[PDB]
Amino acid sequence: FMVSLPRMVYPQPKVLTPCRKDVLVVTPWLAPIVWEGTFNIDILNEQFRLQNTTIGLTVFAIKKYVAFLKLFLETAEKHFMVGHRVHYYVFTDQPAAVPRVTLGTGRQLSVLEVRAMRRMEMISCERRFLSEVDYLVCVDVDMEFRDHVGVEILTPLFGTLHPSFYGSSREAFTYERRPQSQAYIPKDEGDFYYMGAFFGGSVQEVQRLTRACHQAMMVDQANGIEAVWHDESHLNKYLLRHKPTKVLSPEYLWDQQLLGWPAVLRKLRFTAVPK
Ligand SMILES: O=c1ccn([C@@H]2O[C@H](COP(=O)(O)OP(=O)(O)O)[C@@H](O)[C@H]2O)c(=O)[nH]1
Ligand SMILES: OC[C@H]1O[C@@H](O)[C@H](O)[C@@H](O)[C@H]1O
Ligand SMILES: [Mn+2]
């Protein structure tokens, strides 16, 4: 049950004036595509805080990539779901190399040791997540938050537009093109090319996605075939056949060194760290 929002004073939306004219802000299956200027974060914050939303954030830091955790976590503290309950799950082969990062109130971190693709299996921890968080967000570690990433992304299932391909025609997408792989997508299929570095949803829908991608990867392995972009090729096959209920714009996954700062991006929120 959702209780009533309180009175709020904010600018009136006007139906004969679009927030954004330069970009597609809703997909053809009526999922919002999240760009700056499309949401009033005060409305969304009230909605999700009235549900006492808890967001889990999964990150893998194996072998050398433990070096990225300090900046990743410190900038998450400044920008990710601030004011909401957050549980970080750091999966690593070196628990002792996880940096001591100071966290704001209502936020926790758990270190999960693993052995040094396999993110999908490791994500699909199933019972722990169901008991502890409402949404899971699954991101790459070699990244930093530079601006707000909050509850506007939460929905039962989301993917993020790959920053090299958002202006591309589908035939240019680097989907798996061999019919012998479970990730195969023909040249006349595809809505978007999603990046495997940032996806999420409710814990139920993220367990469905990571179970189906892990099953499809095992089939490929049995058949002696490895998809061109690994779990990313499987995530793209999944999201073509199970449409996401929101799509994040490339504000949410950018590489300023490679791609600069185009005008269509009003904010660069989560970016690659030089490596
Ligand atoms: O030796 C490795 C290689 C990969 N990763 C994890 O797998 C993610 C995806 O790999 P990577 O960032 O290298 O892919 P890229 O973005 O360069 O294509 C990394 O962010 C880490 O979270 C890791 O922890 N250790
Ligand atoms: O073509 C797909 C690839 O595009 C690259 O730019 C990216 O570094 C890879 O991880 C993969 O997403
Ligand atoms: Mn990466």
Does 126 qualify as catalytic in the annotation?
no
Domain positions in the chain: 1-275
Q: Which amino acid is at 131?
A: S
User: Smallest Cα–Cα separation from 152: which of 2, 29, 43?
Assistant: 43
Quick one: which H or E segment has residue 206? helix 203-222
DSSP string over 22-81:
SS--B-TTS-BEE-TTS--HHHHHHHHHHTT-EEEEEEEE-GGGGGGHHHHHHHHHHHBS
CATH no., domain 1-275: 3.90.550.10
User: Smallest Cα–Cα separation from 176: which of 186, 167, 189?
Assistant: 186
Pocket of ligand 2 (CB under 6 A): 162, 164, 174, 195, 229, 232
The structure tokens listed for 240 are: 């073509």
> Vertex 123, ends 121 and 127: CA angle to 5°?
110
Resolution value, angstrom units: 1.5
Which letter, b or e, does each residue of 151-161 get, where b requires 16 or more Cβ atoms within 10 Å of its Cβ?
A: bbbbbebbbbb
Mutate which of 62, 195, 230 for ligand 1 pocket (most atoms within 8 A of beta carbon): 62
The structure tokens listed for 41 are: 């974060």
Report the separation in Å between the CA atom of 264 and the middle of ligand 3, taken as the mean of its atom positions: 23
Q: Which segments within the chain are labelled E, that is strand?
A: 33-34, 54-61, 85-92, 107-113, 135-139, 143-145, 157-160, 198-202, 246-248, 270-272
Quick one: which H or E segment has residue 125? none
> Vertex 231, ends 230 and 233: CA angle to 5°?
70
Instruction: Check 176, 205, 232, 251 and give the catalytic one.
Output: 232
**Do the strands 198-202 and 135-139 form a parallel or antiparallel pair, or are they unpaired?**
antiparallel
Q: How far apart are CA 25 and CA 175, in angstroms?
A: 23
Which letter, b or e, does each residue of 20-51 get, where b requires 16 or more Cβ atoms within 10 Å of its Cβ?
A: eeeeebebeeebbbbbbebbeeeeebeebeee
